[PDB]
């Protein structure tokens, strides 16, 4: 795995010693090269995970996420070039280093074999994210958003730390392989119930769950474009990955303890999508759509059926790409109009046609237009829930309807109607912005061709 | 359009009702001859109370006529195709591109239409030169507590253009295509 | 009706508007940025049957050749790929194994 980790580390000295005119260029080049190298990990075995060493391993769950992170870094740099263009060289290098550190941490999280190592790194991801949000945010709510995000995540994580150490003391090892081979069923004792809660709540906080999702709107809206990209593309999937890993030692208590969270998420998807319907901020709308799409994954993980897990992995990858793209488009519009009010800018389709096409394709992916991987994951989760209970189809179909409604509503309000007259600073789309949108869309549509790669280890 | 007024006079309100009533009657009477026959009958009804002088009585009659209009309102009245509510209303709105986008054209694109953009520069200069007088003129003709009506004054002296004229003059054509 | 100031302003605005509309008129030429690909190849190449047939070839002959060739990699290679409904047998003779059968008949009263 060091074939990916070591170059990622070597990015930092390069960025620090790169010329002020070559910082972005060098970073983008070598980040793309690192993504190319990470592509090799997709060759997962049929049964055994790719155990590179005692500390790092990968499976058909970890590899897509690793590729996603290594691919997301260059696009984040490209997006960050615009607003961080009047910054001093040292601070620009600092931002690049924060992004690189975040990518390195995420790689190690997705490859860590030891559960406590995963906890350490997955909670280490907070520091770069917090710094990015609080320092390079544009509004005054950035400080409160960072506080909310950090405190939510820590309040979830600390009981998880206690529980993990308890497991290490009792079982003797926290290695995923040993934990899976030496799995022992949990009883219904209150101690086991609280252990299950401690092991689940942290990941429930990580991937916004209705009731504990209050941090996400603030974080996504206040954070800079790159920060929002990671927040909505990988940092949320951290919760899903950790939950799928930790559910191995949380059975059969999951059957009894899932009902609260299952109902919370099944109603939360509807609630959040309805909230999207009546939103005035573009980034807030995108964030709430993310909340709903992640609630789908939460349901899938809780049900613990093989189809559910496959759909969960596919949905995670698809949502990462789509949400990052949506935030990038909103960022371009925001940079041009210097406001996040959705109704402020209207009829942008006339002024910017190609960006409007990008908007259309992104919204289509958001509403899970067949045969996009978004639809593949959503349909798999829907079928798994239908097997769990036939009544689920009601809420699932209603959520699909509301998602389509609010996505098309966003497209109509922004990229349709009479153009706003006073807004005269809408210049033609830059090549960089179009390239960013293309590098978000094309991989997803290509992934639809060979979904087996992103269908998880249960394929 | 034209500058709005604070209120509508009773005479104005009756005239508005008259046009609406005839149009709805025309919607009811598909055949032209049928409409013309009943149009005069309706016109006579307005003529019958044309002499009516008592404002309270006239206002009472106006209320009754509007109530009658609502009861006899055509559920699907004819609306002109390009009129608000028409089938072709706002149809070509998307094709209407603001002129300021032309300044963002690449030099190659501006080279495709050199004469036009050259004349466009002349229009730009005209706007800037007259702008200062436009604001100054508005202040001179502005009442103490600001404008009470949205009506704008014309060019009092030669060499000046009507204040706030650029958008009205350079507005998009009905059919850009 | 129109107040004198309003009417005068309308007149002035109309004058300027009409000037703007006249300005919005293409010049005698619209310089077109400078066709080596369409030189000798498109000098005086056949404009009736060659054009119709080349469109026909590129749009059907090449695709049909490619698809019929893909049959060689698809139906002959993988089993149960192109499943044809068993041909309806009406009392008669087959091909591979021949053989014939014929049922009884009822009285035929009229046409």
């Amino acid at each position: 795995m060091l074939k990916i980790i070591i170059p990622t580390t070597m990015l930092l000295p390069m960025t620090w010693m790169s010329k002020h005119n070559m910082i972005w260029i060098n970073a983008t080049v070598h980040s793309l090269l690192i993504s190319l190298i990470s592509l090799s990990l997709l060759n997962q075995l049929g049964e055994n995970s790719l155990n590179f060493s005692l500390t790092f391993f990968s499976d058909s769950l970890s590899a897509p996420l690793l590729v996603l992170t290594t691919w997301l870094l260059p696009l984040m740099l490209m997006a960050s070039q615009s607003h961080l263009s009047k910054e001093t060289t040292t601070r620009k290098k600092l931002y690049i280093t924060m992004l690189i550190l975040l990518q390195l941490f995420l790689i190690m999280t997705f490859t860590a074999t030891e559960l406590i190592l995963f906890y350490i790194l997955f909670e280490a991801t907070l520091v770069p994210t917090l710094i990015i949000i609080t320092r390079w945010g544009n509004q005054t709510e950035r400080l409160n958003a960072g506080l909310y995000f950090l405190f939510y995540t820590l309040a979830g994580s600390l009981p998880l730390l206690v529980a993990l150490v308890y497991i290490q003391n009792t079982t003797g090892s926290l290695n995923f392989l040993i934990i899976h081979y030496w799995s022992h069923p949990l009883s219904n004792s209150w101690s086991n119930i609280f252990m299950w809660l401690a092991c689940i709540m942290a990941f429930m906080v990580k991937m916004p769950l209705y009731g504990l999702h209050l941090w996400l709107p603030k974080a996504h809206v206040e954070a800079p474009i790159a920060g929002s990209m990671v927040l909505a593309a990988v940092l949320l999937k951290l919760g899903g990955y950790g939950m799928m890993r930790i559910t191995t030692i949380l059975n059969p208590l999951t059957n009894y303890m899932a009902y609260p969270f299952l109902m919370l998420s099944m109603w939360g998807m509807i609630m959040t999508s309805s909230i999207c319907l009546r939103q005035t901020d573009l980034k807030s709308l995108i964030a709430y759509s993310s909340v709903s799409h992640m609630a789908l994954v939460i349901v899938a993980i809780m049900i613990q059926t093989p189809w559910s897990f496959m759909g969960a992995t596919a949905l995670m990858i698809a949502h990462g790409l789509t949400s990052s793209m949506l935030f990038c488009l909103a960022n371009t519009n925001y940079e041009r109009v210097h406001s996040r009010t959705m109704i402020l800018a209207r009829g942008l389709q006339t002024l910017l046609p190609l960006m409007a096409t990008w908007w259309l394709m992104a919204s289509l992916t958001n509403l899970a237009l067949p045969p996009s991987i978004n639809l593949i994951g959503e349909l798999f989760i829907i079928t798994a829930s239908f097997s769990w209970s036939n009544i689920t189809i009601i809420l699932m179909g209603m959520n699909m309807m509301i998602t389509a409604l609010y996505s098309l509503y966003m497209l109509i309000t922004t990229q349709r109607g009479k153009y706003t007259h006073h807004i005269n600073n809408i210049k033609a789309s830059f090549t960089r912005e179009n390239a960013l949108m293309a590098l978000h869309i094309l991989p997803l549509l290509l992934l639809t061709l060979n979904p087996k790669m992103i269908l998880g280890p249960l394929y | 359009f034209s500058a709005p007024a604070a209120y509508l006079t009773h005479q104005q309100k009756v005239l508005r009702l008259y046009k609406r009533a005839l149009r709805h009657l025309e919607s009811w009477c598909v055949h032209r001859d049928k409409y013309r026959y009943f149009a005069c009958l309706m016109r006579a009804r307005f003529d019958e109370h044309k002499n009516e002088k008592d404002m309270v009585k006239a206002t009472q009659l106006l209320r009754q006529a509007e109530e009658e209009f609502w009861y006899g309102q055509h559920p699907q009245p004819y609306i002109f195709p390009e009129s608000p509510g028409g089938t072709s209303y706002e149809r070509y709105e998307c094709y209407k591109v603001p002129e300021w986008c032309l300044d963002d054209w690449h030099p190659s694109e501006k080279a495709m239409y050199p004469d036009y953009f050259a004349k466009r520069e002349q229009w730009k200069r005209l706007r800037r030169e007259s702008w200062e007088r436009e604001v100054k003129q508005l202040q001179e003709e502005t009442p103490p507590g600001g404008p009470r009506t949205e009506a704008l004054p014309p060019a009092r002296k030669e060499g000046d253009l009507p204040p706030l004229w650029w958008h009205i003059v350079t507005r998009p054509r009905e059919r850009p295509m | 009706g129109y107040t004198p100031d309003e009417k005068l302003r309308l007149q002035q605005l109309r004058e300027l508007r009409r000037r703007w509309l006249k300005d919005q008129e293409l010049s005698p030429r619209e310089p077109v940025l400078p066709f080596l690909q369409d030189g000798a190849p498109w000098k005086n190449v056949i404009y009736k049957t060659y054009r119709h047939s080349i469109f026909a070839v590129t749009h059907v002959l090449i695709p049909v050749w490619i698809i019929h060739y893909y049959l060689k990699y698809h139906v002959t290679a993988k089993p149960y790929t192109v499943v044809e409904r068993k041909p309806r047998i009406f009392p008669g003779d087959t091909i591979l194994e021949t053989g014939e059968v014929i049922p009884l008949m009822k009285e035929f009263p009229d046409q």
Binding site: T350, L351, L352, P353, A428, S429, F430, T431 | V97, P98, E99, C101, L102, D104, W105, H106, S108, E109, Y113, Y116, P172, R173, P176, M177 | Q24, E25, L26, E30
Partner: peptide, 12 residues
């Protein structure tokens, strides 16, 4: 009469 059609810049 050939009239200039105001359009967004399409070169980019």
């Amino acid at each position: 009469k050939r009239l200039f059609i105001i359009k967004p810049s399409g070169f980019y």
